[PDB]
Amino acid sequence: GFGSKPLDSFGLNFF
């Protein structure tokens, strides 16, 4: 997603 977490479809996961 986009945010401070590990992997997501858009890189690093949202909050």
Antiparallel, parallel or unpaired: β 7-8 and 11-12: antiparallel
Beta bridge partners of 7: 12
| Spatial CB neighbours of 10, under 8 Å, sequence gap ≥ 6 | 1, 2
Q: What span, in angstroms and rounded, lies between the C-alpha atoms of 3 and 9? A: 12
Residue 1: CA count within 13 A, CB half-sphere: 6
The identity of residue 14, as a single letter, is F
Question: What technique was this entry resolved by?
Answer: NMR
> Do 14 and 7 contact (CB within 8 A), yes or no?
no
